[PDB]
Amino acid sequence: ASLIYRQLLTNSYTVDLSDEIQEIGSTKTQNVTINLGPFAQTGYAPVN
Amino acid sequence: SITRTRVSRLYGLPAANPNNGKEYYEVAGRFSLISLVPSNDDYQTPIT
């Protein structure tokens, strides 16, 4: 009855395929580059 | 001054013929414009 384990590990390559299938219908959410940093403090020129 | 009249030797540019035949008065030079504009510094794009 140990074969199950040996099979579970042996056939585990097919897991990849399943993931691909589960990724087929999954929605895609792609991120963009985000500015951070020393953002200089700029204001209005002397105004009267 | 206007002929056949006592109104003469006045300083200015009357509206009678400011064109003076010339089709355009030209002034050339440099102009510097310090402004604020929309730039992300190519840093708002997709990651890929």
CSV table of C-alpha atoms in Angstrom, one decimal, chain B residues 8-31:
chain,number,residue,atom,x,y,z
B,8,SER,CA,2.7,120.8,-35.1
B,9,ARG,CA,5.9,119.5,-33.4
B,10,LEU,CA,4.0,117.1,-31.1
B,11,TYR,CA,5.7,113.9,-30.0
B,12,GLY,CA,4.0,110.6,-30.4
B,13,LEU,CA,2.7,108.1,-33.0
B,14,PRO,CA,-0.8,109.1,-34.2
B,15,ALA,CA,-3.4,106.6,-35.2
B,16,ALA,CA,-3.6,108.0,-38.8
B,17,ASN,CA,-1.0,105.5,-40.3
B,18,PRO,CA,0.9,103.6,-37.5
B,19,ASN,CA,1.7,101.0,-40.2
B,20,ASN,CA,3.7,103.6,-42.2
B,21,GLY,CA,3.6,101.4,-45.2
B,22,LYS,CA,5.5,98.6,-43.4
B,23,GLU,CA,3.4,95.4,-43.3
B,24,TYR,CA,4.7,94.4,-39.9
B,25,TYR,CA,6.9,95.7,-37.1
B,26,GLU,CA,9.2,93.0,-35.9
B,27,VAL,CA,11.0,92.5,-32.6
B,28,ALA,CA,13.1,89.4,-32.0
B,29,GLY,CA,14.7,88.0,-28.9
B,30,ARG,CA,14.8,85.2,-26.4
B,31,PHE,CA,12.0,84.1,-24.0
